[PDB]
Amino acid sequence: ALSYREAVLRAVDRLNEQSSEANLYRLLELDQDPGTPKPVSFTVKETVXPRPTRQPPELXDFKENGRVKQXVGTVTLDLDITXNEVQ
């Protein structure tokens, strides 16, 4: 369960790697067993930090009128998420 949340956080970081959007996204909301990958659903929201920034997303304020994405797929507790913009 702590591994879970932490892996979601790592997925947000990787999304920020594979991105070419201008700004870092950060976790907005986290929605709802042998070792097999675990299903994740969460949202992310755009921040005021430009994308090439070694500051963790969580130190970056959310951007007013920042795009929101709903992300779904899996994580291993030890990439395969697609995000689509919320309307």
Side-chain angles (χ1 to χ4, degrees):
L2 200 26
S3 278
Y4 186 72
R5 302 205 281 291
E6 274 154 5
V8 165
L9 294 186
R10 169 181 354 175
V12 172
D13 288 331
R14 285 173 83 168
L15 288 157
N16 283 334
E17 287 304 71
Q18 67 162 30
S19 174
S20 310
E21 311 212 354
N23 292 314
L24 287 190
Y25 279 84
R26 85 177 256 205
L27 177 74
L28 182 57
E29 189 165 334
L30 182 44
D31 320 305
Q32 57 155 27
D33 190 89
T36 229
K38 308 305 178 207
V40 287
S41 165
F42 61 96
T43 46
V44 292
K45 191 176 201 220
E46 179 164 27
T47 74
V48 305
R51 201 197 36 99
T53 263
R54 265 184 215 289
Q55 209 76 269
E58 72 179 76
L59 301 185
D61 294 301
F62 292 114
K63 185 183 159 234
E64 179 76 309
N65 310 167
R67 181 163 302 181
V68 181
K69 311 207 256 233
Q70 170 60 67
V72 281
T74 74
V75 305
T76 82
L77 305 160
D78 279 3
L79 177 56
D80 14 33
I81 256 66
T82 61
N84 301 282
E85 177 183 1
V86 171
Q87 319 309 344

Coordinates of all heavy atoms in Angstrom, one line a residue:
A1 N 0.8 -1.3 0.0 CA 0.0 0.0 0.0 C 0.8 1.3 0.0 O 0.5 2.3 -0.7 CB -0.9 0.0 1.2
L2 N 1.9 1.3 0.7 CA 2.9 2.4 0.7 C 3.7 2.4 -0.6 O 4.0 3.4 -1.3 CB 3.8 2.5 1.9 CG 4.5 3.8 2.3 CD1 3.7 5.0 1.8 CD2 4.7 3.9 3.8
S3 N 4.2 1.1 -0.9 CA 4.8 0.8 -2.2 C 3.9 1.2 -3.4 O 4.4 1.8 -4.3 CB 5.0 -0.7 -2.3 OG 6.2 -1.2 -1.7
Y4 N 2.6 1.0 -3.2 CA 1.6 1.4 -4.2 C 1.7 2.8 -4.6 O 2.1 3.2 -5.7 CB 0.2 1.0 -3.8 CG -0.9 1.2 -4.9 CD1 -0.9 0.4 -6.0 CD2 -1.8 2.2 -4.8 CE1 -1.9 0.5 -6.9 CE2 -2.7 2.4 -5.7 CZ -2.8 1.6 -6.8 OH -3.7 1.8 -7.8
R5 N 1.4 3.7 -3.6 CA 1.4 5.1 -3.7 C 2.8 5.6 -4.3 O 2.8 6.4 -5.2 CB 1.2 5.8 -2.4 CG -0.1 5.5 -1.7 CD -0.7 6.5 -0.7 NE 0.0 6.5 0.6 CZ -0.1 5.5 1.5 NH1 -0.9 4.4 1.3 NH2 0.5 5.6 2.7
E6 N 3.8 5.0 -3.8 CA 5.2 5.4 -4.2 C 5.5 5.1 -5.6 O 6.3 5.8 -6.3 CB 6.3 4.8 -3.3 CG 6.6 5.5 -2.0 CD 7.1 4.6 -0.9 OE1 7.3 3.4 -1.2 OE2 7.3 5.0 0.3
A7 N 4.9 4.0 -6.1 CA 5.1 3.6 -7.5 C 4.3 4.5 -8.4 O 4.6 4.8 -9.6 CB 4.6 2.2 -7.6
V8 N 3.1 4.9 -8.0 CA 2.3 5.9 -8.7 C 3.1 7.2 -8.8 O 3.2 7.7 -9.9 CB 1.0 6.2 -8.0 CG1 0.3 7.4 -8.6 CG2 0.1 5.0 -8.1
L9 N 3.8 7.6 -7.7 CA 4.6 8.8 -7.8 C 5.7 8.7 -8.8 O 6.1 9.7 -9.4 CB 5.2 9.1 -6.4 CG 4.1 9.5 -5.4 CD1 4.8 10.0 -4.1 CD2 3.2 10.6 -5.9
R10 N 6.3 7.5 -8.9 CA 7.4 7.2 -9.9 C 6.8 7.2 -11.3 O 7.5 7.6 -12.2 CB 7.9 5.8 -9.5 CG 8.9 5.1 -10.5 CD 9.4 3.7 -10.0 NE 9.0 3.4 -8.6 CZ 9.1 2.2 -8.0 NH1 9.8 1.2 -8.5 NH2 8.6 2.1 -6.8
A11 N 5.6 6.8 -11.5 CA 4.9 6.8 -12.8 C 4.7 8.3 -13.2 O 4.9 8.6 -14.4 CB 3.6 6.1 -12.7
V12 N 4.4 9.2 -12.3 CA 4.2 10.6 -12.6 C 5.6 11.1 -13.1 O 5.7 11.9 -14.0 CB 3.7 11.4 -11.4 CG1 3.7 12.9 -11.7 CG2 2.2 10.9 -11.1
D13 N 6.7 10.7 -12.4 CA 8.0 11.2 -12.8 C 8.4 10.7 -14.1 O 9.0 11.5 -14.9 CB 9.0 10.7 -11.8 CG 8.9 11.4 -10.5 OD1 8.5 12.6 -10.6 OD2 9.2 10.9 -9.4
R14 N 8.1 9.5 -14.5 CA 8.3 8.9 -15.8 C 7.5 9.6 -16.9 O 8.0 9.9 -17.9 CB 8.2 7.4 -15.8 CG 9.4 6.7 -15.1 CD 9.2 5.1 -15.0 NE 9.6 4.4 -16.2 CZ 9.7 3.1 -16.2 NH1 9.5 2.3 -15.1 NH2 10.1 2.5 -17.4
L15 N 6.2 9.9 -16.5 CA 5.4 10.7 -17.5 C 6.0 12.0 -17.8 O 6.0 12.4 -19.0 CB 4.0 10.9 -16.9 CG 3.2 9.6 -16.9 CD1 2.1 9.6 -15.8 CD2 2.6 9.2 -18.2
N16 N 6.6 12.6 -16.8 CA 7.3 13.8 -17.0 C 8.7 13.7 -17.8 O 9.2 14.6 -18.4 CB 7.6 14.5 -15.6 CG 6.3 15.2 -15.0 OD1 5.5 15.6 -15.8 ND2 6.3 15.3 -13.7
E17 N 9.2 12.4 -17.8 CA 10.3 12.1 -18.7 C 9.9 12.0 -20.1 O 10.3 12.8 -21.0 CB 11.0 10.8 -18.3 CG 11.8 10.9 -17.0 CD 12.9 11.9 -17.0 OE1 12.6 13.1 -16.9 OE2 14.1 11.6 -17.1
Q18 N 8.9 11.1 -20.4 CA 8.4 10.8 -21.7 C 7.7 12.0 -22.3 O 7.2 11.9 -23.4 CB 7.6 9.6 -21.7 CG 6.3 9.7 -20.9 CD 5.3 8.6 -21.3 OE1 5.7 7.5 -21.7 NE2 4.0 8.9 -21.2
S19 N 7.5 13.1 -21.5 CA 6.8 14.2 -22.0 C 7.6 15.1 -22.8 O 8.9 15.2 -22.7 CB 6.2 15.0 -20.8 OG 5.6 16.2 -21.2
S20 N 7.0 15.8 -23.7 CA 7.5 17.0 -24.4 C 6.6 18.3 -24.2 O 6.9 19.4 -24.7 CB 7.8 16.7 -25.9 OG 8.5 15.5 -26.0
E21 N 5.6 18.1 -23.4 CA 4.8 19.3 -22.8 C 5.8 20.2 -22.1 O 6.8 19.8 -21.5 CB 3.6 18.8 -22.0 CG 2.7 17.8 -22.6 CD 1.2 17.9 -22.1 OE1 0.9 18.8 -21.3 OE2 0.2 17.2 -22.7
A22 N 5.5 21.5 -22.0 CA 6.4 22.5 -21.5 C 6.7 22.4 -20.0 O 7.7 22.8 -19.5 CB 5.8 23.9 -21.7
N23 N 5.7 21.8 -19.2 CA 5.7 21.9 -17.7 C 5.5 20.5 -17.1 O 4.9 19.6 -17.7 CB 4.5 22.8 -17.2 CG 4.8 24.3 -17.5 OD1 5.9 24.8 -17.3 ND2 3.8 25.0 -18.0
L24 N 6.0 20.4 -15.9 CA 5.9 19.2 -15.0 C 4.5 19.1 -14.6 O 3.8 20.0 -14.3 CB 6.8 19.3 -13.8 CG 8.3 19.2 -13.8 CD1 8.9 19.0 -12.4 CD2 8.7 18.0 -14.7
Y25 N 4.0 17.8 -14.5 CA 2.7 17.5 -14.0 C 3.0 16.9 -12.6 O 4.0 16.3 -12.4 CB 2.0 16.5 -14.8 CG 1.3 17.0 -16.0 CD1 2.0 17.3 -17.2 CD2 -0.1 17.4 -15.9 CE1 1.3 17.8 -18.3 CE2 -0.7 17.9 -17.0 CZ 0.0 18.1 -18.2 OH -0.6 18.6 -19.3
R26 N 2.0 17.0 -11.7 CA 2.1 16.5 -10.4 C 0.8 15.8 -10.0 O -0.3 16.2 -10.5 CB 2.6 17.5 -9.4 CG 1.6 18.4 -8.8 CD 2.1 19.4 -7.8 NE 1.7 18.9 -6.4 CZ 1.6 19.7 -5.4 NH1 1.8 21.0 -5.4 NH2 1.2 19.2 -4.2
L27 N 0.9 14.8 -9.1 CA -0.3 14.0 -8.7 C -1.3 14.9 -8.1 O -1.1 15.7 -7.2 CB 0.2 13.0 -7.6 CG -1.0 12.2 -7.1 CD1 -1.5 11.3 -8.1 CD2 -0.6 11.5 -5.8
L28 N -2.5 14.8 -8.6 CA -3.6 15.6 -8.1 C -4.5 14.8 -7.2 O -4.9 15.2 -6.1 CB -4.4 16.2 -9.3 CG -5.6 17.1 -9.0 CD1 -5.2 18.2 -8.1 CD2 -6.3 17.5 -10.2
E29 N -4.7 13.5 -7.6 CA -5.6 12.6 -6.9 C -5.3 11.2 -7.3 O -5.0 10.9 -8.4 CB -7.1 12.9 -7.3 CG -8.1 12.2 -6.6 CD -9.5 12.9 -6.8 OE1 -9.6 14.1 -7.1 OE2 -10.6 12.2 -6.6
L30 N -5.4 10.3 -6.3 CA -5.1 8.9 -6.5 C -6.4 8.2 -6.3 O -6.9 8.1 -5.2 CB -4.1 8.5 -5.5 CG -3.6 7.0 -5.5 CD1 -3.3 6.5 -6.9 CD2 -2.3 7.0 -4.7
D31 N -7.0 7.6 -7.4 CA -8.3 6.9 -7.3 C -8.0 5.4 -6.9 O -6.9 5.1 -6.5 CB -9.2 7.0 -8.5 CG -9.1 8.5 -9.1 OD1 -9.4 9.4 -8.3 OD2 -8.7 8.9 -10.2
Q32 N -9.0 4.5 -7.0 CA -8.9 3.2 -6.3 C -8.6 2.1 -7.3 O -8.9 2.2 -8.5 CB -10.2 2.8 -5.6 CG -11.5 2.9 -6.4 CD -12.6 2.0 -5.9 OE1 -12.7 1.8 -4.7 NE2 -13.5 1.6 -6.8
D33 N -2.8 -11.3 -5.8 CA -1.7 -10.3 -5.4 C -0.4 -11.1 -5.2 O 0.2 -11.1 -4.1 CB -2.2 -9.7 -4.1 CG -1.3 -8.6 -3.6 OD1 -1.4 -7.4 -4.0 OD2 -0.3 -8.8 -2.9
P34 N 0.1 -11.8 -6.2 CA 1.4 -12.5 -6.2 C 2.7 -11.7 -6.4 O 3.8 -12.2 -6.1 CB 1.2 -13.6 -7.3 CG 0.1 -13.1 -8.1 CD -0.5 -11.9 -7.6
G35 N 2.6 -10.4 -7.0 CA 3.7 -9.7 -7.5 C 3.4 -9.2 -9.0 O 4.2 -8.3 -9.5
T36 N 2.3 -9.6 -9.5 CA 1.8 -9.2 -10.8 C 1.6 -7.7 -10.8 O 1.2 -7.2 -9.7 CB 0.6 -10.0 -11.2 OG1 0.7 -10.6 -12.5 CG2 -0.7 -9.2 -11.2
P37 N 1.8 -7.0 -11.9 CA 1.5 -5.5 -11.9 C 0.1 -5.1 -11.4 O -0.8 -5.9 -11.5 CB 1.5 -5.2 -13.4 CG 2.5 -6.2 -14.0 CD 2.4 -7.5 -13.1
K38 N 0.1 -3.9 -10.8 CA -1.2 -3.5 -10.1 C -1.9 -2.4 -10.9 O -1.2 -1.4 -11.4 CB -0.9 -3.1 -8.6 CG -0.1 -4.1 -7.8 CD -0.8 -5.5 -7.7 CE 0.0 -6.6 -6.9 NZ -0.3 -8.0 -7.4
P39 N -3.2 -2.5 -11.0 CA -4.0 -1.4 -11.7 C -4.0 -0.1 -10.9 O -4.2 -0.1 -9.7 CB -5.4 -2.0 -11.6 CG -5.2 -3.5 -11.4 CD -4.0 -3.6 -10.6
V40 N -3.7 1.0 -11.7 CA -3.7 2.4 -11.1 C -4.7 3.2 -11.9 O -4.8 3.0 -13.1 CB -2.3 3.0 -11.2 CG1 -1.4 2.4 -10.1 CG2 -1.6 2.9 -12.6
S41 N -5.4 4.0 -11.2 CA -6.1 5.2 -11.8 C -5.8 6.4 -11.0 O -6.0 6.3 -9.8 CB -7.6 4.9 -11.8 OG -8.3 6.2 -12.1
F42 N -5.3 7.4 -11.6 CA -5.1 8.7 -10.9 C -5.2 9.9 -11.9 O -5.1 9.8 -13.1 CB -3.8 8.7 -10.2 CG -2.6 8.5 -11.0 CD1 -1.9 9.6 -11.5 CD2 -2.2 7.2 -11.4 CE1 -0.8 9.4 -12.4 CE2 -1.1 7.0 -12.3 CZ -0.4 8.1 -12.7
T43 N -5.3 11.1 -11.3 CA -5.2 12.3 -12.0 C -4.0 13.1 -11.7 O -3.4 13.0 -10.6 CB -6.4 13.2 -11.8 OG1 -6.7 13.3 -10.4 CG2 -7.7 12.6 -12.4
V44 N -3.5 13.8 -12.7 CA -2.4 14.8 -12.6 C -2.8 16.1 -13.2 O -3.6 16.2 -14.1 CB -1.2 14.3 -13.4 CG1 -0.6 13.1 -12.8 CG2 -1.5 14.1 -14.9
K45 N -2.1 17.1 -12.7 CA -2.4 18.5 -13.0 C -1.1 19.3 -13.3 O -0.1 19.0 -12.6 CB -3.2 19.2 -11.9 CG -3.7 20.6 -12.4 CD -4.7 21.3 -11.3 CE -5.5 22.3 -12.0 NZ -5.7 23.6 -11.2
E46 N -1.2 20.2 -14.2 CA 0.0 20.9 -14.7 C 0.5 21.8 -13.6 O -0.3 22.3 -12.8 CB -0.4 21.6 -16.0 CG 0.7 22.5 -16.6 CD 0.5 22.9 -18.0 OE1 -0.7 23.0 -18.4 OE2 1.5 23.1 -18.7
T47 N 1.8 22.0 -13.5 CA 2.3 22.9 -12.5 C 3.0 24.1 -13.2 O 3.1 24.1 -14.4 CB 3.4 22.3 -11.5 OG1 4.6 22.1 -12.3 CG2 3.0 20.9 -11.1
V48 N 3.5 25.0 -12.3 CA 4.2 26.2 -12.8 C 5.7 26.0 -13.2 O 6.4 26.9 -13.7 CB 4.2 27.3 -11.7 CG1 2.7 27.7 -11.3 CG2 5.0 26.9 -10.5
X49 N 6.2 24.7 -12.9 CA 7.6 24.4 -13.2 C 7.8 23.9 -14.6 O 7.2 23.0 -15.1 CB 8.0 23.3 -12.3
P50 N 8.7 24.5 -15.4 CA 9.0 24.0 -16.7 C 9.6 22.6 -16.7 O 10.2 22.3 -15.7 CB 10.0 25.0 -17.3 CG 10.5 25.8 -16.1 CD 9.6 25.6 -15.0
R51 N 9.4 21.8 -17.7 CA 9.5 20.4 -17.7 C 11.0 19.9 -17.3 O 11.1 18.9 -16.5 CB 9.1 19.7 -19.0 CG 8.7 18.2 -18.8 CD 8.7 17.4 -20.1 NE 9.7 17.8 -21.1 CZ 10.9 17.2 -21.3 NH1 11.2 16.1 -20.6 NH2 11.7 17.7 -22.2
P52 N 12.0 20.5 -17.9 CA 13.4 20.1 -17.5 C 13.7 20.8 -16.2 O 14.3 21.9 -16.2 CB 14.2 20.7 -18.7 CG 13.5 21.9 -19.2 CD 12.0 21.6 -18.9
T53 N 13.3 20.2 -15.1 CA 13.5 20.8 -13.7 C 13.6 19.7 -12.7 O 12.7 18.8 -12.5 CB 12.3 21.7 -13.4 OG1 12.6 23.1 -13.6 CG2 12.0 21.8 -11.9
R54 N 14.8 19.6 -12.1 CA 15.1 18.6 -11.1 C 14.4 18.8 -9.8 O 14.8 18.1 -8.8 CB 16.7 18.6 -10.9 CG 17.4 17.5 -11.7 CD 18.9 17.4 -11.5 NE 19.7 17.1 -12.7 CZ 19.6 16.0 -13.4 NH1 18.9 15.0 -13.0 NH2 20.4 15.9 -14.5
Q55 N 13.5 19.7 -9.7 CA 12.7 19.8 -8.5 C 11.6 18.8 -8.6 O 11.1 18.5 -9.6 CB 12.1 21.2 -8.5 CG 11.8 21.8 -7.1 CD 13.0 22.3 -6.3 OE1 13.6 21.5 -5.6 NE2 13.3 23.5 -6.5
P56 N 11.4 18.0 -7.5 CA 10.3 17.1 -7.5 C 9.0 17.8 -7.7 O 8.8 19.0 -7.2 CB 10.3 16.5 -6.1 CG 11.6 16.9 -5.5 CD 12.1 18.1 -6.2
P57 N 8.0 17.2 -8.5 CA 6.8 17.8 -8.8 C 6.0 18.3 -7.6 O 5.3 19.3 -7.7 CB 6.0 16.7 -9.5 CG 6.9 15.7 -9.9 CD 8.2 15.9 -9.1
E58 N 6.2 17.6 -6.5 CA 5.4 18.0 -5.3 C 5.8 19.3 -4.7 O 5.1 19.8 -3.9 CB 5.4 16.9 -4.3 CG 6.7 16.6 -3.6 CD 6.6 15.5 -2.7 OE1 6.5 14.3 -3.2 OE2 6.3 15.8 -1.4
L59 N 7.0 19.8 -5.0 CA 7.4 21.1 -4.5 C 6.9 22.2 -5.5 O 7.1 23.4 -5.2 CB 8.9 21.3 -4.4 CG 9.5 20.3 -3.4 CD1 10.9 20.5 -3.2 CD2 8.7 20.3 -2.1
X60 N 6.2 21.9 -6.6 CA 5.8 22.9 -7.6 C 4.3 23.1 -7.5 O 3.5 22.2 -7.6 CB 6.0 22.3 -9.0
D61 N 3.9 24.4 -7.3 CA 2.6 24.8 -7.3 C 1.8 24.4 -8.5 O 2.4 24.4 -9.7 CB 2.4 26.3 -7.2 CG 3.0 26.9 -5.9 OD1 2.5 26.5 -4.8 OD2 3.9 27.7 -5.8
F62 N 0.6 24.0 -8.4 CA -0.3 23.8 -9.5 C -0.5 25.1 -10.2 O -0.6 26.1 -9.6 CB -1.7 23.3 -9.0 CG -1.7 21.9 -8.4 CD1 -1.9 21.6 -7.0 CD2 -1.4 20.8 -9.2 CE1 -1.8 20.3 -6.5 CE2 -1.3 19.5 -8.7 CZ -1.6 19.3 -7.4
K63 N -0.6 25.0 -11.5 CA -0.8 26.1 -12.4 C -2.3 26.4 -12.4 O -3.1 25.5 -12.6 CB -0.3 25.7 -13.9 CG -0.4 26.9 -14.9 CD 0.0 26.5 -16.3 CE -0.6 27.4 -17.4 NZ -1.3 26.7 -18.6
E64 N -2.7 27.6 -12.2 CA -4.0 28.1 -12.4 C -4.5 27.8 -13.8 O -3.8 28.2 -14.8 CB -4.1 29.6 -12.1 CG -5.4 30.3 -12.3 CD -6.4 30.0 -11.2 OE1 -6.5 28.8 -10.8 OE2 -6.9 31.0 -10.6
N65 N -5.6 27.1 -14.0 CA -6.0 26.8 -15.4 C -5.0 25.8 -16.1 O -4.8 25.9 -17.3 CB -6.2 28.0 -16.3 CG -7.0 29.2 -15.7 OD1 -7.0 30.3 -16.2 ND2 -7.7 28.9 -14.6
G66 N -4.4 25.0 -15.2 CA -3.5 24.0 -15.7 C -4.3 22.8 -16.2 O -5.3 22.5 -15.6
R67 N -3.9 22.2 -17.3 CA -4.5 21.0 -17.8 C -4.5 19.9 -16.7 O -3.5 19.7 -16.0 CB -3.7 20.5 -19.0 CG -4.2 19.3 -19.6 CD -3.7 19.1 -21.0 NE -3.9 20.2 -21.9 CZ -3.6 20.2 -23.1 NH1 -2.9 19.2 -23.7 NH2 -3.9 21.3 -23.8
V68 N -5.6 19.2 -16.7 CA -5.7 18.0 -15.9 C -5.8 16.8 -16.7 O -6.5 16.8 -17.7 CB -7.0 18.2 -15.1 CG1 -7.3 17.0 -14.1 CG2 -7.0 19.5 -14.3
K69 N -5.1 15.7 -16.4 CA -5.2 14.4 -17.0 C -5.6 13.3 -16.1 O -5.2 13.3 -14.9 CB -3.9 14.0 -17.7 CG -3.4 15.2 -18.6 CD -2.5 14.7 -19.7 CE -1.0 14.9 -19.5 NZ -0.3 15.6 -20.6
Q70 N -6.4 12.3 -16.6 CA -6.8 11.1 -15.9 C -5.9 10.0 -16.5 O -5.9 9.8 -17.7 CB -8.3 10.8 -16.2 CG -8.8 9.5 -15.8 CD -8.7 9.2 -14.3 OE1 -9.3 9.9 -13.4 NE2 -7.9 8.2 -13.9
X71 N -5.1 9.3 -15.7 CA -4.1 8.3 -16.1 C -4.5 7.0 -15.6 O -4.9 6.8 -14.4 CB -2.8 8.6 -15.4
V72 N -4.4 6.0 -16.5 CA -4.8 4.6 -16.2 C -3.8 3.5 -16.9 O -3.2 3.8 -17.9 CB -6.2 4.2 -16.8 CG1 -7.3 4.8 -15.8 CG2 -6.3 4.8 -18.2
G73 N -3.6 2.3 -16.2 CA -2.7 1.3 -16.7 C -2.2 0.4 -15.5 O -3.1 -0.1 -14.8
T74 N -0.9 0.2 -15.4 CA -0.3 -0.5 -14.2 C 1.1 -0.1 -13.7 O 1.9 0.5 -14.4 CB -0.2 -2.0 -14.4 OG1 0.8 -2.3 -15.3 CG2 -1.5 -2.5 -15.1
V75 N 1.4 -0.5 -12.4 CA 2.8 -0.3 -11.9 C 3.3 -1.7 -11.3 O 2.5 -2.5 -10.8 CB 2.8 0.7 -10.7 CG1 2.3 2.1 -11.2 CG2 2.0 0.3 -9.5
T76 N 4.6 -1.9 -11.3 CA 5.2 -3.0 -10.5 C 5.7 -2.4 -9.2 O 6.3 -1.3 -9.2 CB 6.3 -3.7 -11.3 OG1 7.6 -2.9 -11.2 CG2 6.1 -3.7 -12.8
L77 N 5.4 -3.1 -8.1 CA 5.9 -2.6 -6.8 C 7.4 -2.7 -6.7 O 8.0 -1.9 -6.0 CB 5.2 -3.3 -5.7 CG 3.7 -3.3 -5.6 CD1 3.2 -4.5 -4.8 CD2 3.1 -2.0 -5.1
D78 N 8.1 -3.6 -7.4 CA 9.5 -3.6 -7.5 C 10.1 -2.5 -8.3 O 10.0 -2.4 -9.6 CB 10.0 -5.0 -8.1 CG 10.0 -6.1 -7.1 OD1 9.6 -6.0 -5.9 OD2 10.4 -7.2 -7.5
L79 N 7.2 1.7 -19.0 CA 6.0 2.4 -18.5 C 4.7 1.9 -19.2 O 4.8 1.4 -20.3 CB 6.1 3.9 -18.7 CG 5.0 4.9 -18.3 CD1 4.6 4.7 -16.9 CD2 5.4 6.3 -18.6
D80 N 3.6 2.0 -18.5 CA 2.3 1.5 -19.1 C 1.1 2.2 -18.5 O 0.3 1.6 -17.8 CB 2.2 0.0 -19.1 CG 3.2 -0.7 -18.1 OD1 3.6 -0.2 -17.1 OD2 3.6 -1.8 -18.5
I81 N 1.1 3.5 -18.7 CA 0.0 4.4 -18.3 C -0.3 5.2 -19.6 O 0.6 5.6 -20.3 CB 0.5 5.4 -17.2 CG1 -0.1 5.0 -15.8 CG2 0.0 6.9 -17.4 CD1 0.4 3.6 -15.4
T82 N -1.6 5.4 -19.8 CA -2.0 6.4 -20.7 C -2.9 7.4 -20.0 O -3.7 7.0 -19.2 CB -2.9 5.8 -21.9 OG1 -4.1 5.3 -21.3 CG2 -2.1 4.7 -22.6
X83 N -2.6 8.7 -20.2 CA -3.3 9.8 -19.7 C -4.1 10.4 -20.8 O -3.6 10.5 -21.9 CB -2.4 10.9 -19.2
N84 N -5.3 10.8 -20.5 CA -6.1 11.6 -21.4 C -6.7 12.8 -20.7 O -7.0 12.7 -19.5 CB -7.2 10.8 -22.0 CG -6.6 9.6 -22.8 OD1 -6.1 9.7 -23.9 ND2 -6.7 8.4 -22.2
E85 N -6.7 14.0 -21.3 CA -7.2 15.2 -20.7 C -8.6 15.2 -20.2 O -9.5 14.7 -20.9 CB -7.0 16.3 -21.8 CG -7.5 17.7 -21.4 CD -7.3 18.7 -22.5 OE1 -6.9 18.3 -23.6 OE2 -7.7 19.9 -22.4
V86 N -8.9 15.7 -19.1 CA -10.2 15.9 -18.5 C -10.9 17.1 -19.1 O -10.2 18.2 -19.2 CB -10.1 16.1 -16.9 CG1 -11.4 16.5 -16.3 CG2 -9.6 14.9 -16.3
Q87 N -12.1 17.0 -19.6 CA -12.9 18.1 -20.2 C -13.7 18.9 -19.2 O -13.4 19.1 -18.0 CB -13.8 17.6 -21.3 CG -13.3 16.5 -22.3 CD -11.9 16.7 -22.9 OE1 -11.4 17.9 -23.0 NE2 -11.3 15.7 -23.5

